[PDB]
Structures are given as C-alpha cells and as structure tokens.
Amino acid sequence: MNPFASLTLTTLTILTIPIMMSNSNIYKTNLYPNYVKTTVSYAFTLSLVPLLMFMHTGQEMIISNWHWMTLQTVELSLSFKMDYFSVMFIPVALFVTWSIMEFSMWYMHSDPFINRFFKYLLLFLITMMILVTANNLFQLFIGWEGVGIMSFLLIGWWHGRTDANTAALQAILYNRIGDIGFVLSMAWFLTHSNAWDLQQIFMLNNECPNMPLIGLLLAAAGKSAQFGLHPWLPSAMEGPTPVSALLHSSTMVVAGVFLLIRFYPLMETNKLVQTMTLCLGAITTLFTALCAITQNDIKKIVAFSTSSQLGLMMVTIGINQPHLAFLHICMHAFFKAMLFMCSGSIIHSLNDEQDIRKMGGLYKAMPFTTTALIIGSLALTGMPYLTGFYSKDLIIEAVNMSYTNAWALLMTLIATSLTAAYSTRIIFFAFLGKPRFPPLVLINENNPLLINSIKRLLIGSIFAGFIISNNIPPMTVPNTTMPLYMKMTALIVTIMGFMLALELNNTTYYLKFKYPSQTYKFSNMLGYYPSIMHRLPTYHNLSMSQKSASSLLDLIWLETILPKTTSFIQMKMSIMVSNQKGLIKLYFLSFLITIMISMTLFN
Amino acid sequence: SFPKYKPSRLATLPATLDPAEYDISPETRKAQAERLAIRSRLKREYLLQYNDPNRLGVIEDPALIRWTYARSANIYPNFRPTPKTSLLGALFGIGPLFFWYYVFKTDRDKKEKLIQEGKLDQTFNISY
Amino acid sequence: AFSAPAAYLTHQQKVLRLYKRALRHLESWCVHRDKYRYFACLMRARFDEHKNEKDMVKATQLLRQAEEEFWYGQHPQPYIFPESPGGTSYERYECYKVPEWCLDDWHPSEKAMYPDYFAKREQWKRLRRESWEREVKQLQEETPPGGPRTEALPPARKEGDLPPLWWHIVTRPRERPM
Amino acid sequence: HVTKDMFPGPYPKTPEERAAAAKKYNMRVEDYEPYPDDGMGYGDYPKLPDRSQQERDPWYDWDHPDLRLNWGEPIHWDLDMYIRNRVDTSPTPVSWNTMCKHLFGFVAFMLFMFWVGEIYPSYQPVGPKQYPYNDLYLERGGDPTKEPEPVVHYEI
Amino acid sequence: MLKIIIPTTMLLPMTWMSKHNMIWINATVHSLLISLISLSLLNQLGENSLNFSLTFFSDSLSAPLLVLTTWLLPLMLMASQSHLSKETTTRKKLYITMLILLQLFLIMTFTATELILFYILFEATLVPTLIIITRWGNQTERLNAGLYFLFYTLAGSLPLLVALVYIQNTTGSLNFLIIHYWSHPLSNSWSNIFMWLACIMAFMVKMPLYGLHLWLPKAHVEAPIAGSMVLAAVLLKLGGYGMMRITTILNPLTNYMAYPFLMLSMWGMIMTSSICLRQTDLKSLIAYSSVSHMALVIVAIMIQTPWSFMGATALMIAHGLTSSMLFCLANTNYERVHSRTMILARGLQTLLPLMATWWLVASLTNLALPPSINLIGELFIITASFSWSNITIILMGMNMMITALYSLYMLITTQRGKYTHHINNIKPSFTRENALMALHILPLLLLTLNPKMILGPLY
Numbered sequence A: 001m002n003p004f005a006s007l008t009l010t011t012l013t014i015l016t017i018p019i020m021m022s023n024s025n026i027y028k029t030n031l032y033p034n035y036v037k038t039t040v041s042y043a044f045t046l047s048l049v050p051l052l053m054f055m056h057t058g059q060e061m062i063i064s065n066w067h068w069m070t071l072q073t074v075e076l077s078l079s080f081k082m083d084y085f086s087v088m089f090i091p092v093a094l095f096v097t098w099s100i101m102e103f104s105m106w107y108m109h110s111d112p113f114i115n116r117f118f119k120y121l122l123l124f125l126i127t128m129m130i131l132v133t134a135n136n137l138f139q140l141f142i143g144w145e146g147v148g149i150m151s152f153l154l155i156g157w158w159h160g161r162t163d164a165n166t167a168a169l170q171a172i173l174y175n176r177i178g179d180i181g182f183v184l185s186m187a188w189f190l191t192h193s194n195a196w197d198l199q200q201i202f203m204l205n206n207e208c209p210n211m212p213l214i215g216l217l218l219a220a221a222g223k224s225a226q227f228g229l230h231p232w233l234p235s236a237m238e239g240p241t242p243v244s245a246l247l248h249s250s251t252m253v254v255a256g257v258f259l260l261i262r263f264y265p266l267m268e269t270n271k272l273v274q275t276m277t278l279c280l281g282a283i284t285t286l287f288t289a290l291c292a293i294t295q296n297d298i299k300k301i302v303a304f305s306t307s308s309q310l311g312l313m314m315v316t317i318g319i320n321q322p323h324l325a326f327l328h329i330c331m332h333a334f335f336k337a338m339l340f341m342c343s344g345s346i347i348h349s350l351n352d353e354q355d356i357r358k359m360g361g362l363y364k365a366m367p368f369t370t371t372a373l374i375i376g377s378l379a380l381t382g383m384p385y386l387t388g389f390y391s392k393d394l395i396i397e398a399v400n401m402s403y404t405n406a407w408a409l410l411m412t413l414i415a416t417s418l419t420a421a422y423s424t425r426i427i428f429f430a431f432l433g434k435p436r437f438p439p440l441v442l443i444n445e446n447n448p449l450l451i452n453s454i455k456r457l458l459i460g461s462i463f464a465g466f467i468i469s470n471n472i473p474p475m476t477v478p479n480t481t482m483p484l485y486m487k488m489t490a491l492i493v494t495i496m497g498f499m500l501a502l503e504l505n506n507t508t509y510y511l512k513f514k515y516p517s518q519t520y521k522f523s524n525m526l527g528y529y530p531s532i533m534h535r536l537p538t539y540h541n542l543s544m545s546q547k548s549a550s551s552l553l554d555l556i557w558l559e560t561i562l563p564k565t566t567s568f569i570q571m572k573m574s575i576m577v578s579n580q581k582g583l584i585k586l587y588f589l590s591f592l593i594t595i596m597i598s599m600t601l602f603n
Numbered sequence B: 001s002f003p004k005y006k007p008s009r010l011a012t013l014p015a016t017l018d019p020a021e022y023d024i025s026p027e028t029r030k031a032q033a034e035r036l037a038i039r040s041r042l043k044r045e046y047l048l049q050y051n052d053p054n055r056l057g058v059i060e061d062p063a064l065i066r067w068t069y070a071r072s073a074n075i076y077p078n079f080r081p082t083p084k085t086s087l088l089g090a091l092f093g094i095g096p097l098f099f100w101y102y103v104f105k106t107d108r109d110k111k112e113k114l115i116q117e118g119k120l121d122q123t124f125n126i127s128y
Numbered sequence C: 001a002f003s004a005p006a007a008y009l010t011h012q013q014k015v016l017r018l019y020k021r022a023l024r025h026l027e028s029w030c031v032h033r034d035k036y037r038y039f040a041c042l043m044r045a046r047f048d049e050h051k052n053e054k055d056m057v058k059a060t061q062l063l064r065q066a067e068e069e070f071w072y073g074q075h076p077q078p079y080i081f082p083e084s085p086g087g088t089s090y091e092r093y094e095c096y097k098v099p100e101w102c103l104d105d106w107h108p109s110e111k112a113m114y115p116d117y118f119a120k121r122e123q124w125k126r127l128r129r130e131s132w133e134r135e136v137k138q139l140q141e142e143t144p145p146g147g148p149r150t151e152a153l154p155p156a157r158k159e160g161d162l163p164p165l166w167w168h169i170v171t172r173p174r175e176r177p178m
Numbered sequence D: 001h002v003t004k005d006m007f008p009g010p011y012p013k014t015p016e017e018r019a020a021a022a023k024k025y026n027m028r029v030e031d032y033e034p035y036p037d038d039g040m041g042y043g044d045y046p047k048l049p050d051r052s053q054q055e056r057d058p059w060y061d062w063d064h065p066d067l068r069l070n071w072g073e074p075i076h077w078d079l080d081m082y083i084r085n086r087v088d089t090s091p092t093p094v095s096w097n098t099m100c101k102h103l104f105g106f107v108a109f110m111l112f113m114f115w116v117g118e119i120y121p122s123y124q125p126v127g128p129k130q131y132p133y134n135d136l137y138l139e140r141g142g143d144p145t146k147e148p149e150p151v152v153h154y155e156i
Numbered sequence E: 001m002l003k004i005i006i007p008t009t010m011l012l013p014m015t016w017m018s019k020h021n022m023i024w025i026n027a028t029v030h031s032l033l034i035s036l037i038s039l040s041l042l043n044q045l046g047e048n049s050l051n052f053s054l055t056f057f058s059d060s061l062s063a064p065l066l067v068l069t070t071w072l073l074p075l076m077l078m079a080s081q082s083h084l085s086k087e088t089t090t091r092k093k094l095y096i097t098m099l100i101l102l103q104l105f106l107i108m109t110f111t112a113t114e115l116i117l118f119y120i121l122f123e124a125t126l127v128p129t130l131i132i133i134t135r136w137g138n139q140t141e142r143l144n145a146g147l148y149f150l151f152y153t154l155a156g157s158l159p160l161l162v163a164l165v166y167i168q169n170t171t172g173s174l175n176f177l178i179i180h181y182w183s184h185p186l187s188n189s190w191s192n193i194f195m196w197l198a199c200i201m202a203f204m205v206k207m208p209l210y211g212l213h214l215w216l217p218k219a220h221v222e223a224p225i226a227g228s229m230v231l232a233a234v235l236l237k238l239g240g241y242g243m244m245r246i247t248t249i250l251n252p253l254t255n256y257m258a259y260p261f262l263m264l265s266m267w268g269m270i271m272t273s274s275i276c277l278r279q280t281d282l283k284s285l286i287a288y289s290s291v292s293h294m295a296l297v298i299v300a301i302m303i304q305t306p307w308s309f310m311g312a313t314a315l316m317i318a319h320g321l322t323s324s325m326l327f328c329l330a331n332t333n334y335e336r337v338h339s340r341t342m343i344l345a346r347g348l349q350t351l352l353p354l355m356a357t358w359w360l361v362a363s364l365t366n367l368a369l370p371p372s373i374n375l376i377g378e379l380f381i382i383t384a385s386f387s388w389s390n391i392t393i394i395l396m397g398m399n400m401m402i403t404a405l406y407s408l409y410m411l412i413t414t415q416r417g418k419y420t421h422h423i424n425n426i427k428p429s430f431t432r433e434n435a436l437m438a439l440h441i442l443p444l445l446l447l448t449l450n451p452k453m454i455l456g457p458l459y
C-alpha cells in the first residue's frame, strides 16, 4: 500500500541497526567500519526510490505513527514530514556520508578507536535524519541538540589535547546561545498557536509577528555560524578531517538555514525579519571570505569558505527564495565535501602537515587529488554548466533582480570576488610552486578507498546540478529577461577575482620584502573578533562568578545576615544573663525592684 | 622607530620587551639564583617522593591544600565590614532583584491593562 | 626540554634565541626557498656587523632594540611544526599514553597472555627496587648541604649503580603508543 | 599530614610575620606580596601576578605538563580561571586598544552602511506584479461573502 | 497503603536479626522487593485520588515520589557498603536502621491525609538525617553542617505549626480533601499576609530558596554518600510537595505575595549556576546545581499554572535521579583519591573508560538533553513562565547556557586531558559501582518513554 511511507521509514530504521549491533561481537572486529559503510550505502540506494516517486508524481505525505503524551488540548506524537525538502536532502546526505566513511576507512586506518569513530558518525547521521524529517518542533529540537552533542564529542576526539576540548566547549556555548532563541520560538508558538505541529502553526499564523521569527533567526544564526556567532565553525577544525568534512561542512552546519527554510510560509509574510536575515547573511559572507583570503591553514580556509556559503544561503533566504537556498545546500554539500576529501588527502600525504607554506608542487606529484581539487574549486566559483552554476548563478540573478538593500548586494558581489580569491590562493599555494615539504617523500595515492570515494563525489559535483535542476518541478518565477551586462555580472566578477588574486600572488616570487599593513593584520587575526570577545567577556564573567556571587554574597553577606548575627546576639545575651557572681545581695535587690515594678505596673 | 606595543590586562607585556630584564645587577642575579634554588629543592623533594617503589598513594600537595582552604574556608574569618564591601555587597545583592521586579511588574501591569480593555487578541490561547 | 634550566640567560643566549625567532619568522614570511635564502643571508650579514662590539652598554642597546623591530614584524600567524606547542597535532596522542603501573592491575586471565613481557617486567621491578635503595643514599651523600642549587641530577659513579631517579624517565610510555 | 601552622591566616602587619608567611608559601620575602588589606577575605595569601598559564614555558618539564605547574610552588588565587581552557593573557602582535578600536570601527561602519542601504534600496525599472482575480482575493484569506472592490489590470 | 508500610517496618527486625555477614544482601533484596511493591501505586485515575483510608491517600503527585523514595534505598545501601567495611556489625546495623527509618518517615509523609500528620513526619525525617550527617561523617565540620541543617529547618518550620493550628481552629479541619472542597478566598490583610508567609517559608527553606540556601552546601559536602543521595534526591522535594499541597488555601493572595520569591529564584538560579563555574569541589558544584534546579522548581510552583505543576513534578523526579547519580560518581572518585577536589585527579577517561561513559551520560542528563524528562520539565516550566511574562525567557536562556557550561566543565576537568602522574592507586572500577550507575540511569531513559507517569495530577 503506497510504498512511499514504508520505504521512507525503512531507510531511517535500517540506519539504526549498526547502533543496535554495537554491543555484538562484530563491534570488536576490524569489519565494523565496512559494516557501517555498507549499511549507509544500502540506505542511500533504498532512499533513492521515494525520490523517484516524488519526481514522477510530486507525492507528499505525513506519517504520525506513535502517539506520545497529550497535555490537555495539545497532542504530541512521533510525526515525520517527508516533504520535498526531506525526500530531497536525505539521498544527498546519505551519499555524502557514504563517501565520507569510505574515505575515513583509509584516513583512520591507524586510529585504535575506529569502530567508535564510525559509531559516532552513524549516530550523527541518525540524529540529522531526525532533524530533517521532523514534523513537530519537539522532534526538531531533539535532532537540534543531538547533532550539537555529537559535534561536541567528535571535535574533542583527541581528549588529551587541551585545544580540542576548548573548541568543543566553544561550539557548545554558541549552540546554546542559539538554543535560547529556539526555546523562545517554541514557547511563543505553543502559547499563541496552541501547537508545536507544523500544520497547525502555518494555519493559525497568517501574519506572523516579530518575536517567533526573531527567535528562529537567532537559532539559525547560532547553528549556521553567522557573523555574531561565527568563530566556533573555524575553531571546530580541531577534529579529525572526516569530522570536518561531514559535520562542519555540508550536513550539520546547514541546520539553521534548513530551519529557516522549514518556516518559509511565515517568513514571507514578514518584511523586517527578512531584512535582518538578508543583512546578517551578507555581512557574514563578506567577513568570512575576507578572513579566508589570507589564511595559511587549508582547513581554516575551506571552513571559512563554508561559512561564506552559509551566509550566501541566508542571503537567498532573505530575498524570499527558500527553494533556491535548498538547491544551494544540496549542491554545496557535494562540492565542499569533495573539497575536504582533497584537503585531507593532501594533509595525510604530507605527514599531517596542514600549513600551505610547506606544500609546493603537487600538480604532477599527485595528479588525481589535483584534478579533483581543480574541479571542486571550479564548481565552488561557479563555472557555467557545473554543479555550482545551477545554484549560485540563480542566487546572483535573484539578488540582483529583487527589491533588496544596495549594501547587501554590493557585499554579496565582493564576497563572490573573495571566493574566487581564496580559491585561486589555495590552488596557487598548494599546487603550482616548487616543493617545500620535508625531504623524506611519503606521497602516495594508490588506494582504492580514497580514489573511489573522491570519484563518486566528482561525478556528483559534475552532473548532480544538471540532473536535479532538470528533474525537479518548477517552484518560482524566473528572471527570464535581464540586461546583458547584468546577466554576466557573476562571471565578470569571478574572472576579475581570479585575475587580480593571481596577479597579487605572482608578486611573491619577487625578491622584495615589506612589512604588512593594517588591513592584512585585521584580516589575518579574523577581524580581531576571536581575540577580544574570547578574553573580555569570559574573564569579566568568571571573575564576577568568584568575587561577587561566590565570596561577597554567598560566603560573607548571606552568612553575616541570618546565621552569624543570630550566633553573635545569642552569645552576647547568654554572656550577659549567665554572668552573675553568686551574690544573693544583688539577687534580692533585683527581687525588690521587680516586686515594686509589678505592684506599680499590673494593677 | 616603530609603533609601540601598549600592554593591557588581558594582553600582557611580552617577555622580551620588559625594561626590567635588561637592567641586570648582582642583587638581581642573586635573587634569580635563590629562586631557582627554591624551585630545585621543591623539585628534588617531589621526585624523591615520586620515584620511590614503596609508595603507592597520591602525593599530598600542601600548596593545593592551602589554595583550596584559602578559597573556601579562610574568607569569612578575614572579612571586615568596609565601605567598599558594604556598597559592593548591597549593590550586587539587591540591585538586580529590584531591577527585575520593576521590569516584570511593569510588564504584567501593561498586560493586565490590555486584557481589561480587551485589546489583546488572545485567540487560540488555551494552554498556560 | 630534557636539560635543566639555568638561573638566567646570558647575552649570547639571548642573541642566539632572537636570531632563531627572527629567522623562523622570516621563513614564515618568505614562502619560497630562494627568496627566503636571499633574505636570510641578508639578515645574517646584518647581524654579524655588530659581532666584535665590546661595549656592554652598547651590547645591551643592540638586540633589545632589534627585539622591538622583531615584535613589529613578527608575522602574526607564523609557521609551527605539527608536534610543537602551537602545532595542530601538539597533544594528539596524549590520550593514548597509559601509565606502566596500570599493568599491575590486570586480571590474571589477561596476564596469561604475554607471559614473557611480564617476566621481563618482574626483572625490571627487582632492578628498580635494588637501584632505588642505592640511589637514595647516593643522592643523600652527593647533594650539597642546605639543599640543591640547580635541578640537575648527578650520574652513577660506581659499577653496579644506576642513574638516580631513573625509573620514570626510562619508563615513558612512547611518543606514539597507538 | 599538614599542620595547623601550614594554613592561611590573617593579614600580615609586622615584618617578622610577613617573612614567616613568605616562608609558609615557599617563596622569597621580597617576592611575597599579600593582597591589599580590605574586607574581602584574602587573608594571608600571596598575590601572584595575574598572568595566565598558557604563556608559561611549554618546554619546561613541569610535574603537571597539561596545567603547567610544579608540585610545591604556590598557586595563584585565580588558577581555575587561567587553565589554558579559559581566558588567557598571552600578548598579541597587535595592541589591545588597536584591535578594540579596529574591531569596533569595522562593526560600526557595517551597521551604518546597512542602515543607509535600507534608506536607499535597489530595484528594477518595473511596476508591481499584477494578479488576475481581484489580486488573488479568494485564495488569499478567502471571505467570499464580502464581494470586495473589483480591480481591472491595465493592458499596454 | 499498609502493604508498603508494614514490609518497611519489618525491614528493621530482619536487619537486626541478620547474620553478621548477610546484612547487605538481605537489605538490598528486600528493599528491591518493597520497591517492586510500590509500583502498584502508579496506576492513578483522572478522578480525585486513591483514598485508601482516613489516614493515607495516594495521588499521581505522591506516587512518583513514593516510587523514587522506595527505589533510592537499595542504591544507598550499595553505595554505603564500600566505606563501612572496617566497621563493627552493631554500627552497620544502626546505619541500616537509620536508612530504613528515613524511608518509613518519607513514605508516611508523602501520603499524609492530614496536615498536622504531614508536619510531624516532615520534621521526623530530620533526626535520622542529622544523625547520619554528624556520626558517619569524615571531616570535623560535620557538626557545624548538622547544626545549620537542623536550625534552618526548624526556624522555617516553627511558624508553620502555629499557622496550621490556627487554620484548623478557624476552618475546623486540616484534612486535604476537606480543605480543597471548602477553600475560600483570603482577603488581602496583614494577618493574612503573615499567615501566607508562615505557610510558605517552611517549604521555601528546604528547596532551598536562594536567600536561604547556605545550609545545603555544608550538609551535602559533609554527609556520607547515602546522606548526600537522600538529601539531593528526596529531602529537597519535600518542600515542593508541601507547597503544591498548601498553595490551594493561599489564593488569591499568592499573586501579590509571589513577587519577592519569583525574583529571588530567577536571579538565584543565575547566581548559583555562575557559582558552579568557579568551584574547586565536586560535591559543592553538584550542590549548587541542585540549588539552581530547585530554584526553577520554586518559580514553577509560584507561577501556579497546570503546565507549571507538570513541569515541576517532572523536574523534581529527574533532578533527584540525576543528582543522586552525580554524587555517586563523585564518591567513586573520592574513595580512590581521598581528596574530593576536581583538579587533583585528571584524565580518568584513559584509565576508567566505562566510568567515563557513565560520567558523560550523567552530565548530559544534568544538561537537560532532549527527550529526557529533565528537559521535559525544563521546557514546561519555561513555557509557563513565558506565558506569565515574555521577559522571563531571557533569564531562563542564560540559565540553560550556564548550566551546559559547568556540566561540561565538570566533564572536562576530571575525565579529559592528561592523568596526574603521581597517583597510582586508581584501581579498575568494581562491578558494584557500575551496577549502581546503571540502576541510576536506566529509570530515566525508561521514564522518557512514558512521561505522563511523572507529570502529576494536572495531566
């Protein structure tokens, strides 16, 4: 009976079986990672069927299967939404996870706890599937917190390293800052709309007020690492390369953008929140690209690229184009995941070297990673007919052909320029010059796992944009007419960025040296934001937490008021009363005094 | 000449930029010698207690005991009622309470007035 | 890291350390090898000009002034080796470093495996028990009165003697235990 | 195994007790400096410099390599705030004031230009989008029993 | 109700007539059997209550608390079995007798059809706890902690007895059923204001309120592991149960009256969560986290809405289990290290991996990770407060963030990093400790499947 529901629940269910078998004997053998990888691949090829059913018919469904607790009028149930977004995002995420695990079987070959690593990866995948398929706000919050906790665990994978623990706590802190707005949104929706269910919320909110949308925007900014709460995403590179390639690049970090996409019927009916989202996305993409164009760590550069892409996604959201932002999510997953595969291959081949100053000629020394990175950089930049072109070109056209802010449009164009800039920076400083690695050459790629995992995402980043764009139904009005110069704005900006950054990098061979300027220092230290904001508030908090809350009030004044005052008063009274020298003279004089006082007072 | 680096509380002076280190004197050298002598005596005691095979227990650290005792149990007996202590305690223990009371009282008064006149539009509000 | 520190740093130690830091930061600035070689030789030549200077006050004037210049152009993001205290793999494998005495707590069924290892460990334990008893007296007699002045330990001087306080230096887990 | 005299006491006033307290905390008399004698119960605990643990030498063989501390050395009052997992005081290549002003300046400039762009938006040389049936009245909200004002859209 | 009370009474002769080396086995088995017997009470009705007799009744607010109180005793026995090893048989029997008497007093307290009987048992629970704290305590400050714990409670509760006898003199009955059906409004008068204060402050002191929370760190730090467990898990919930029971008579006076308490709790949760960040002690940190959670419960009770009451009940149960688990973990560390300071023993995940997993789960459930019942109560109380006022959320937001911080801080200081080189007496974790943690944690993850079972009478 209508196999859509059975298949779309079976994928998620079979995604959980290795977690059940994690206590079995297979978990103690060396075949566990292959078991998990095969399970993920079968889940992907099984979830491909509901995608085909949607493409044929446009069939949509809600599955509210298990009834959880019901409080008064409100009903809470295990409900799954399998809308276009869910049935479209699930296959892409499963394919990316399959490639990531295939790569990780080789990248984590010498890691003693590799079964636990694979288990951690599968748990994150399950939680993200829960987040994507959620129909009510409570299940979505469950996935929201689960992905954050798995990210905390995976970032601090090497728990003997202080900086990994610091980065994990940073991620938790920023995610809780977003969680504040998430909880505000949940509370407002329950109080005013009387439900956490998606269907009820859309129905009873024809003109959504500011507060729930501001809460949703705060949560999205927290989880997507916008300018206010950006540094945790670059700081999350402390984890293993597969963790950075799966979670912090293509699947987890689009959680905020996906959440804002989920509530697009209420986003389109408000004009202020749209403006805030647009401005936040523009400033985030600009600042992150500006920081990226000057970094030396390849992982940092690519993470800043991811953050800039998230900013571009929220720019797309702010101009009331949620479906196009979803398409951007799907394409960016492919090509940015493959970009991290290439980066991790380079890092592993250079004996855990991440600085680009110690990598020179790799165009010929290692060709397959070379062509994969070239194709990924071309797709990111937006080459016509490439995967990037289908989404990013429409992004540029829609931002240009809309009643938006002039400053936001300018910042988006500059962000595109800087994207081209750091792309050519990566290529030039990792691939073209003379070798700069230590003399003992350990460069090797002849491994089936790495090659197959990279080439699958290569086929994806070549053909997925074309096939998906021509297979999905049309969902928005096109900009079918456009000035010729304004149609070519994206290409001319990209080529200008290429040529200018190439010229600026080509002057490094010159035998002339000068000290850096203030702009370079500002861009290299991340706008000085991670310095001040990670030293001024925390100290000012922690000191207070010891000086005022702990010692001044709790240890001293609260103690002075009730217990110490009582002790002192009772001690003084006892000393005064009991200090009698035993002279009956004084006793009987007091007796006479009280006798006469009683004779004078009580009658 | 080059622009000068200005130290702050959260960004201290660099080790190699202190004017004090370049001013060397026999008294300073003797001070450093006795500092390193104390450090080496403590290190020798710790390693003597550390290496021994017979010992099978945590080595007790008097410095840690002093730190914890001073942080926790030595505060009140050394307290003295002082204008600084009085004003800081009164502020940090009373001001936030009255501030939040004022804020919430004003909010609830506004809400109560709006519900009395009825221009609040509480449709679909059934759970509280 | 292995050697004991000194009570102070001499002028030549300071100039050598400044030379090391400046050359490393110039290598960080000059990505390519030929540019780095040219500028490093230019810097070495500049450095050697004041080599035969005898005035101590002038000597103090030199390098400290250079240090301010070094601080101005110190390449805010210098290159750091992966295992260095600022590297990206500084403490990656500290979580795999398990102490040796933990083996004393293994179940006998676990000690049934690897019997030769535990026999050699027993020989090591016997050697430690004898050597420590010798070392206590040796260090007591060799230490200067009033407490040690420098945290450096003397070597063994007899035939059957072992270096004092050797057990926890020899029995380090490994650099990369797993 | 710690005795009564080994615990912190009241503030030192005389040089003899100052020297005795300096001896208690295993430091020099000249290096010993208690906190200023106010109401807060610092008592007789040394005021070590407010420098963090991150900028301590990472090559010295500490007894606690992760915390960068030695066994018998005195402990800073705010140690748990400086544990390399928290706020640090390591000097930066750029001065604190320059970063603050530069950071503050960048943020302020961005806020002002976004406001200006809100004041001066961008659009196209076009009129508003036109919709067929009374500006989609029946299927945007409904209310068919009101018969709103009809609108005819201009043919050009 | 006697089917639970009589076996608990029979626990005493069984313990005292037990063989010298079979007390722990006999006590644990029969305590678990009594806990199983207590499970029958959970099947509540949507109607009035389970009125067994004139003296005792059951309610879906009383039933989860009774089940938790019964379940806590085997855990306390297993935790106490370790450090009482070098102790004479008579004193171990006395310890078990005190635990049994505490359970009996709590069981009679939670049913308690009449308010004077409730007060008598509510204050009878005080003696066994005081004796346990001041007798089998390690440090020399256990006497001062016992004095604080006794006198805070009695100063709070002495006006309550006068208020109760006055209320019975005026109304004519102290029975809960009669009081609920015959409740009449209290006029806003000075005498009524002082009657409200006398009725409320006794339960406020035991939560405890932020102003009156000083006794709790002393009592928790100085008590043995069983004492800490019973204080954090059950004894703190007595104030919340008393407030929920006695608040019915108080209206409409509660609205004006509630502001001083609402502000104190909303600021004190922030203050105590921030205090947790700078602590050198595990037990003190857990105590302050308990203070923050109970401040939130105070806010929920004072708002006095249905969602508030359900959230308060769920949060009380979840906090009891979580805090008992946290104290058990800290005690397992202390029994090896004998220091009870976080910064000394470090990197315990490398040496004890399963115990580190238990630490992670306990810190996650203290952090209120969904869909755990901790977050269920958290979210219900937060929503009720938002409906009460849209500004409260800001404070709540801070609280949540701060909570997570110190939780993971406690997880990072002791489990992650590098193990202290000198400590070598860290033996592998015993089966008893792992069983203790499993028996602490499994009920939470079972209850999250059936939240309505702990949501109180207003479900």
Ligand SMILES: CCCCCCCCCCCCCCCCCC(=O)OC[C@H](COP(=O)([O-])OCC(O)COP(=O)([O-])OC[C@@H](COC(=O)CCCCCCCCCCCCCCCCC)OC(=O)CCCCCCCCCCCCCCCCC)OC(=O)CCCCCCCCCCCCCCCCC
Binding pocket: A293, A294, A413, A414, A417, A418, A421, A422, A425, A493, A497, A500, A501, A504, A514, A515, A516, A517, A518, A519, A520, A523, D105, D106, D108, D109
């Ligand atoms: C309407 C007509 C449309 C056509 C328009 C015109 C077409 C193009 C014309 C070209 C225009 C300029 C393009 C060249 C950019 C400059 C590149 C350069 O020379 O850098 C070297 C040079 C210094 O290099 P260095 O210190 O020696 O570094 C040593 C080695 O090179 C170390 O090198 P390394 O190996 O470590 O790494 C190399 C890296 C390191 O290089 C860097 O340091 C990068 C830093 C500067 C480049 C960033 C430019 C992006 C500008 C956006 C700024 C947004 C507003 C920010 C507000 C700040 C408020 C304070 O360089 C790169 O990778 C490439 C840099 C990025 C260039 C590629 C894309 C830029 C072209 C797009 C710009 C706009 C066109 C949009 C297109 C759409 C059409 C509308 O940079 C500069 O001199 C800065 C020039 C411009 C900076 C503007 C900010 C000045 C702010 C001063 C205060 C203003 C008052 C504020 C008051 C506020 C109070 C409330």
Ligand SMILES: CCCCCCCCCCCCCCCCC[C@@H](O)O[C@H](CO[C@H](O)CCCCCCCCCCCCCCC)COP(=O)(O)OCC[N+](C)(C)C
Binding pocket: E188, E189, E190, E193, E210, E211, E212, E260, E261
């Ligand atoms: C220390 C840690 C915390 C401990 C617990 C603290 C919580 C208990 C505090 C009690 C809260 C307030 C008590 C009385 C509130 C009544 C409302 C009053 O504040 O408002 C005005 C009252 O005005 C003035 O407040 C009059 C009273 C002034 C004298 C009270 C002392 C003020 C500060 C003392 C605080 C010390 C508390 C602790 C004692 C040990 C309203 O004016 P009015 O319409 O006319 O009176 C209405 C009441 N009627 C109808 C019964 C007549």
Ligand SMILES: CCCCCCCC/C=C/CCCCCCCC(=O)OC[C@H](COP(=O)(O)OCCN)OC(=O)CCCCCCC/C=C/CCCCCCCC
Binding pocket: E152, E155, E156, E157, E159, E162, E163, E166, E190, E191, E192, E194, E195, E196, E197, E198, E201, E205, E212
């Ligand atoms: C910190 C707790 C909060 C304390 C707030 C106030 C503290 C200052 C008060 C100090 C004690 C004052 C003692 C005298 C109070 C007199 C109140 C009174 O008599 O009202 C009784 C009232 C009406 O009297 P009638 O004459 O019978 O009525 C006929 C005419 N209408 O009847 C009652 O309600 C009796 C209830 C007893 C009142 C309680 C008295 C004690 C104060 C209330 C408790 C607050 C302090 C709690 C201590 C906290 C420590 C944890």
